[PDB]
Amino acid sequence: DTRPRFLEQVKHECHFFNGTERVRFLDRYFYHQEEYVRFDSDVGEYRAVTELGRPDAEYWNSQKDLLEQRRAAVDTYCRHNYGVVESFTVQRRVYPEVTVYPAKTQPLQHHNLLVCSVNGFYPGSIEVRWFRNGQEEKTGVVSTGLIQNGDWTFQTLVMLETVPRSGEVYTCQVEHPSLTSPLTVEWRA
Amino acid sequence: EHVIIQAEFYLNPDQSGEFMFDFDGDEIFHVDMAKKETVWRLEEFGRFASFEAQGALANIAVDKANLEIMTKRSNYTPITNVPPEVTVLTNSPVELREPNVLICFIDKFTPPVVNVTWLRNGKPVTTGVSETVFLPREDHLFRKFHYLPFLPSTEDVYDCRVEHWGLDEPLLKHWEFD
């Protein structure tokens, strides 16, 4: 199929700062990826983003009834929906399962990678640190970064490049909003 | 800071529309346009809230009407295909014979039309598969997830096969037990 495609998108965005203390509503219209007109509650009128949107900003800005609907949205729409969802979104807290397993950077002979697998958590902000004998190890650390699972959970792997020696204690430490103190998992050769 | 977005789209000539709500990058729900039903991304959401799915159809009708106007206004300038990036991962560390889930993450593409097949040992598998709708990105491309629960073995290999009009050939992303 090579028939040309045409895409319209609309994003009605509600931005919250300190709960509902400060709220910004952004009504955004797109043709393919090009935002062409928007309503910003900071302005209170539509503005053309590109020349493609100038006819809509002129026309819609001429209709005071339309504008007052948009001007009310921070209250009637944003703050209302925030109230509806806040308890299972803003306040959602799922703590991570933490697994530590050894691996190899390339097929070698000896495991030379310690993987700290941090799975199933929400929200996304997390701090994962590696320790050797209680001193933090900051060199040779690499990660997948933060991975969305698409189901309201995240995961991340944080790997330490090291040749483990007997007598060494390795600790992966996880800090996350769902936790009241750091989660630590130990590993020994 | 949190962000709630009501994201809509309408695509010609496919005449496909979508209506969903997003919280901080995760889908709260979308409207099944054919059934006119609200589909909560987690079941527990539907016990805490409701949404009159019928009203999503009004938005899509306006968006279809706006698309015809903008298409004409643009002198019929069509979309440029952006092919996806594809990643295959599991949602937990893999243990032999311990049930797990393969995730196929399809990212950074447009238009929002894709064919995705899970292959086990080169053969399509459909038992137990699920998927998300097209999810919006802040750069106004799309992303999507497909899922395959599975029993990890040494004798099975897997691929996520993605077809998209911006790809020259299907993109196959492999997974096997290390």
């Binding site: 609309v10 009605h12 009504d27 219209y29 309503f39 006819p55 809509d56 026309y59 819609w60 339309l66 609907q69 948009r70 949205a73 009637t76 729409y77 209302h80 929906n81 509806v84 969802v85 | 009501q6 809509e8 709500f21 805490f48 809230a49 409701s50 949404f51 009159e52 009203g55 999503a56 009004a58 938005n59 306006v62 968006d63 009407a65 706006n66 106007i69 903008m70």
Partner: peptide, 13 residues
Amino acid sequence: DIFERIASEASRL
């Protein structure tokens, strides 16, 4: 506990 949708604005022909 009812989600509110906001209307999309209609361009003129």
